Design a protein around this nucleic acid. Structure first.
Ligand code: SF4
Ligand SMILES: [Zn+2]
Lengths: 675, 134, 124
DNA sequence: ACACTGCGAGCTCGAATTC
DNA sequence: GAATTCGAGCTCGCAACAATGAGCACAT
């Protein structure tokens, strides 16, 4: 299959392509020749992954001096392994079509707990534990006596790596994480340091977000890799929530009381440098003095640094090198583990963030515990407001960076928050042989009562009955699986336990089993494996869950799991938290974003992410109701993207509960029949 | 570069807001221009919704907190020099503004009297029809 | 409520009739009717009774045309079949229906019929 | 230093017939 | 030739808008 986009000869690994998928390769080539960014919305997960890889890998053959390396930041380790398996399928197609071999290697990067051979350290569960026991065997003072080569502890694989792993590189043959461990097994090398060494000489590199947008990581691993590359941020809805949490720390009473134990253990070891311990003891009793107050919430992002020089007299010139010398002090102290000093590194990371980064930051000290009048639980948040302060290296260092997901809801918000100027900013819609989706907005109830989940319209039983009368009448006409996302956990409890006291939850269990998705991961995976079992045998099930949850982002509901997806209200965040109430005051002055146009943007990208989870494939069909009155408004249904908005007609816009069934009952009957 | 005093600077009150070519040091709150609300401009200069955002070039606005709501929404603020430059551009001259304001202020006095006239025709229709039949 | 009365007519097996008035004289979205009891339309519009017929063909389906005989509507209802008999359609005449007097029909007595004339003549 | 979206007024037509 | 009846669509003034929750991948 020789497929010709506007100037290039793209070798596609399939036979039939979709008519919109040609324009996705056409609009992505328009970015790469212009050497600029791009915000492309493209619905599916696969197909998008194999058409983005068919173009760029074929682009670096015809213009091998303009692009050299493709970086592919995916969300987490399951989609890291999925992209590489879509690359062998493209490489082996090129192996059959051309009959030759190539100088083409593709890697995959992850943590040390995903690339590990050493048996005494690999079953360690927590990720901060495997980083310490590796460092107990790979530190430069542990190898200092290993120049003698004694029977003193070490890593067998790491000392066998740097003696033979620099002369010869990896030849070819795209590597998964399991292939790098298998190559590390039969050769005896470390997989983690082989992948990090060979990341400088590769052509496709697939890691997570945090190697590139996390500032205390990206200068160590992705520093000198490529100046003319292509970065792809796949499934990049929450870039804003990633660049905020990477530059935001959190301090409480439990953290600072553990830092006194770290300074206690540092006092016993110096007697066995002294100005730096009195430096940290000065800083620790100030932040404890600042949490000592029981007063109103207050914010002072550079004025914290002025009052830190009054009672304590510590300036910002030694405070900038606070986290540097603490990394140097533990090196000269020759300590065994470094996970035990994790509260003190968090205080050292807090000290180097107030000193340097103060333009769009805040320090929100909240002695007032949430929802309770007087309970002694203070906490100060060092919250970042500006999501463009972690991509200013990435938008500058690389040549062209593409932000692609399936549900970028307005495309003109992402270049407003993130300070950059794209060159295409395009959207697409999937082609279909049927109507593969039937979105509806089930508004008012069966007795003409409004259904919305406001804050005043939650206690009254004229709405809780109309949610129970909806899930009852959809569980009798939908086969094999209904996913019901609620807005929170305290609203899922106060509705299910108020359906049970009425005669509504008795009649839902006659039709389908119901499996509540709880917060702890042990009960959830039990209730999820029985859900996928109940959809496969006769009964069918209802997985009622929370929209800002684990199941809403991770688990993909392929066909006959979740034929319907029911949104029980607009999934807003808590719109009166003092952190969110301060970020929106930064989004009003800077970028002139309205305060109400961001709460709905944040909600219509989490209500369109979990609804868009119901359809992944060719023959997948799926109902998707929106059970709130407020979804019908123009500033809300105009947000949700163009591939679920081009089937939302004006008839399915204020359907009542009984009228929404006969749209669903006619839709599933029509889809059940062959082509 | 200011366009009134010719002083060189980085930024100021305006020219990050209303695109007005002046420095902050003239400032003349009540001697060059003031902040007017979107509702005030819309009901005072008789500007529609499709003149503050689509007549080229589009003039932008400033979002602030609604003063007597404090938790509800916003309050757009346009510039009074940008409005009187736009109202003099959309509605002929200065005098053509007010002459089309007289026909609208009598129209709301026109609807006030005819709604007290259509009720006389409607309510007496039900009482005349009972007498007219036999 | 034009959009939901029309949607309660199609996807609901309970609401069965609907009383339009001069709206469906074009290519609207009237959802596949099966009978059409046309009562007292415009004067001699043979365009109209070929657009009322357009709802029916969208016996299988069959539409009626109520005429008050020995009045001016008898001359009108032959002007409007003048286009449909030139296409092949045959208009039967039902002088007496199949047992109209036996069910519970309205306006049985003359007392309830005297009140309707006083409602009509009071318009003027 | 207030204010989004629906929703009825005028305005001006068309179709066919009275006046 | 000049009304009516009842429909149509296009402008456009008018009145008043809103926004409530909970946790593991990634560097020495
Ligand atoms: S040095 Fe190699 S073998 Fe040792 S813990 Fe790290 S990755 Fe595992
Ligand atoms: Zn000046």
């Amino acid at each position: 299959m020789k497929l010709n986009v506007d100037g290039l000869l793209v070798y596609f690994p399939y036979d039939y392509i979709y008519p919109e998928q040609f324009s996705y390769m056409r609009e992505l080539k328009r970015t790469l020749d212009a050497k600029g960014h791009g915000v492309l919305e493209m619905p599916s997960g696969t197909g998008k992954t194999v058409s983005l890889l068919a173009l760029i890998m074929a682009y670096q053959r015809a213009y091998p001096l303009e692009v050299t390396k493709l970086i592919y930041c995916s969300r987490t380790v399951p989609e890291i392994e999925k992209v590489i398996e879509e690359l062998r399928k493209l490489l082996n197609f090129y192996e059959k079509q051309e009959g030759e071999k190539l100088p083409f290697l593709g890697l995959a990067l992850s943590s040390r707990k995903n690339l590990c051979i050493h048996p005494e350290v690999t079953p360690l569960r927590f990720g901060k534990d495997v980083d310490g026991k590796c460092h107990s065997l790979t530190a430069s003072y542990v190898r200092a006596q290993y120049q003698h080569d004694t029977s003193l502890p070490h890593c067998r694989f790491y000392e066998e790596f740097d003696a033979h792993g620099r002369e010869v590189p990896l030849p070819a043959g795209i590597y998964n994480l399991d292939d790098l461990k298998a190559l590390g097994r039969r050769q005896g090398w470390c997989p983690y340091f082989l992948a990090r060494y060979s990341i400088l000489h590769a052509n496709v590199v697939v890691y997570s977000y945090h190697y590139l947008l996390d500032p205390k990581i990206a200068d160590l691993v992705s520093k000198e890799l490529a100046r003319k590359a292509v970065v792809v941020f796949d499934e990049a809805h929450n870039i804003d929530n990633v660049c905020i949490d990477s530059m935001s720390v959190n301090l409480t009473r439990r953290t600072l009381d553990r830092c006194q134990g770290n300074l206690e253990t540092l006092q016993k070891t110096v007697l066995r440098a002294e100005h730096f311990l009195g430096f940290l003891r000065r800083l620790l009793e100030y932040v404890k003095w600042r949490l000592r107050v029981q007063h109103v919430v207050q914010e002072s992002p550079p004025a914290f640094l002025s009052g830190l020089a009054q009672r304590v007299c510590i300036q910002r010139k030694p405070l900038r090198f606070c986290a540097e010398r603490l990394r140097s002090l533990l090196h000269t102290l020759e300590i065994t583990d470094l996970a035990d000093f994790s509260p003190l590194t968090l205080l050292a990371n807090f000290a180097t963030l107030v000193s340097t980064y103060a333009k769009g930051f805040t320090i929100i000290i909240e002695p007032f515990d949430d929802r309770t009048p007087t309970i002694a639980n203070p906490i100060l948040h060092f919250s970042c407001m500006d999501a463009s302060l972690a991509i200013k290296p990435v938008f500058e260092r690389f040549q062209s960076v593409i932000i692609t997901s399936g549900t970028l809801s307005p495309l003109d918000i992402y270049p407003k928050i993130l300070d950059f100027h794209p060159v295409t900013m395009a959207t697409f819609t999937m082609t279909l042989a049927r109507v593969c989706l039937c979105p509806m907005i089930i508004g008012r109830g069966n007795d003409q009562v409004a259904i919305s989940s406001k804050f005043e319209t939650r206690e009254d039983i004229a709405v809780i009955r109309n949610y129970g009368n909806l899930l009852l009448e959809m569980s009798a006409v939908v086969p094999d699986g209904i996913v019901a996302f609620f807005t929170s956990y305290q609203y899922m409890e106060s509705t299910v336990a108020s359906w049970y006291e009425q005669g509504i939850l008795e009649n839902i269990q006659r039709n389908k089993l119901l499996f509540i998705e709880t917060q702890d991961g042990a009960e959830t995976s039990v209730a999820l494996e029985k859900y996928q079992e109940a959809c496969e045998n006769g009964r069918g099930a209802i997985l009622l869950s929370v929209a800002r949850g684990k199941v809403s982002e991770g688990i993909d509901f392929v066909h006959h799991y979740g034929r319907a997806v029911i949104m029980f209200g607009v999934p807003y965040v808590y719109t009166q938290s003092r952190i969110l109430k301060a970020r929106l005051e930064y989004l009003r002055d800077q970028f002139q974003i309205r305060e109400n146009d961001f709460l709905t943007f944040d909600a219509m990208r989490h209500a369109a992410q979990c609804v868009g989870r119901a359809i992944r494939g060719k023959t997948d069909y799926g109902l998707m109701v929106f059970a709130d009155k407020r979804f019908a408004r123009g500033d809300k249904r105009g947000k949700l993207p163009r591939w679920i908005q081009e089937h939302l007609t004006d008839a399915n816009l204020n359907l009542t509960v009984d009228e929404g069934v006969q749209v669903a009952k006619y839709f599933l009957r029509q889809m059940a029949q062959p082509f | 570069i200011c366009e009134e005093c010719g002083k060189e600077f980085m930024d100021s009150y305006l020219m990050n807001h209303f695109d007005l070519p002046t420095c902050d040091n003239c400032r003349d709150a009540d001697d060059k221009h003031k902040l007017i609300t979107k509702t005030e401009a819309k009901q005072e200069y008789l500007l529609k919704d499709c003149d503050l955002e689509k007549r080229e070039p589009p003039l932008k606005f400033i979002v602030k907190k609604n003063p007597h709501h404090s938790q509800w929404g916003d309050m757009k603020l346009y510039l009074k020099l940008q409005i009187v430059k736009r109202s003099l551009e959309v509605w002929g001259s200065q005098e053509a503004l007010e002459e089309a304001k007289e026909v609208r202020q009598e129209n709301r006095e026109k609807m006030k009297q005819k709604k007290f006239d259509k009720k006389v025709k409607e309510l007496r229709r039900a009482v005349r029809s009972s007498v007219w039949k036999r | 409520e034009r959009m939901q009365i029309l949607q309660n007519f199609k996807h609901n097996p309970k609401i069965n009739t609907i009383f339009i008035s001069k709206v469906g004289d074009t290519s609207f979205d009237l959802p596949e009717a099966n009978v059409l009891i046309q009562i007292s339309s415009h004067g001699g519009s043979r365009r109209q009774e070929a657009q009322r017929l357009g709802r029916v063909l969208r016996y299988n389906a069959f539409f009626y045309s109520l005429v008050s005989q020995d009045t001016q509507e008898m001359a009108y209802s032959t002007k409007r079949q003048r286009f449909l008999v030139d296409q092949g359609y045959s208009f039967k005449v039902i002088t007496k229906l199949a047992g109209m007097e036996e069910e519970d029909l309205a306006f049985s007595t003359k007392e309830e019929q005297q009140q309707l004339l006083q409602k009509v003549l009071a318009a003027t």
